[PDB]
Ligand binder design. Sequence first.
Ligand SMILES: Nc1ccnc(=O)[nH]1
Ligand SMILES: [Zn+2]
Ligand SMILES: [Zn+2]
Lengths: 189, 182
Amino acid sequence: MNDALHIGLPPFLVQANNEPRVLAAPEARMGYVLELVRANIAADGGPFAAAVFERDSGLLIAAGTNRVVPGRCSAAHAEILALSLAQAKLDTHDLSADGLPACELVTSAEPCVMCFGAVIWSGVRSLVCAARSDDVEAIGFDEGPRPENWMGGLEARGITVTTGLLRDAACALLREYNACNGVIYNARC
Amino acid sequence: GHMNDALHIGLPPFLVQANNEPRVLAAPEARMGYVLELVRANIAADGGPFAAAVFERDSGLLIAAGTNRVVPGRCSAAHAEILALSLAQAKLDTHDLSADGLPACELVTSAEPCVMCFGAVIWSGVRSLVCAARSDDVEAIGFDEGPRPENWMGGLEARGITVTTGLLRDAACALLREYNAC
Ligand SMILES: Nc1ccnc(=O)[nH]1
Ligand SMILES: [Zn+2]
Ligand SMILES: [Zn+2]
């Protein structure tokens, strides 16, 4: 509405937040996240996606993707959407809240500065990344002024960090995205 | 706010009204003054002691305002800045406030941004950031600003965003203290 923050979720993302799913393996988890990436790109969104799991069971709780441009909202990153939807579903601003399960945020690329903090407040206890910062930098997409050893900063707060998971297919997904960005029409896109 | 087809965070009456009531505050202190009033209402509306609003830098026209809604809105990302920036990018229909053909936009804020919002402002397109309360003032009432890069103000300056702080600061603290007192 015009009297409430309202970020719309594309059909495939709604489905992604609708169908129950459980993926044990980190590979499996990131694999599904990378599926939403390809989708997102085909739904007019940035090449970024994320999902919050119950970490210790693999129960998908919520997913998000970059809807910045189509959404006319710079704050609509993949991490912000998944972290919110996740908090809304479990109905609490704290995923670290008393009773809730230990949550985990699987993202296609190392988080930017905005989301970096977004992660700290969320209440998740673990972050799992795919594409290293350089890969993202490598094609525009600025990570933003993150403080020294942000990764360390997270470990310190109890948020375990991991990067590189399925980085190969992640960087590929970034590239065909970039490959298909210009304005001159290409039927192969 | 748990929906399906979209992420939805409702705004309380006063805030709803704030984004639809025509307003033009030319002076800087006027903008900040208004923002502080919002803080009060927000506290009164089970919200955190934080408010903010985007104004067209030169004209002083209120474009959108946002408060802290984390708790009542079960969303840890709902800070005064995030909302005010997002409703502004909504009204103007663009994810870029520094976009072509749009009068420069400023974000007057009750306190200095948290590392999150910090990045948030950067991606918004706002061309200036005026703050009231300082960071120690914030950590003083028990709120985290998170780990920010050495000299964040520089980062903003360097990225085309003018930083200016300490405005009505003292008035912004009586509000913080009051909140902490209760
Ligand atoms: N500066 C801030 C600290 C904590 N929460 C907020 O909403 N804002
Ligand atoms: Zn981000
Ligand atoms: Zn903030």
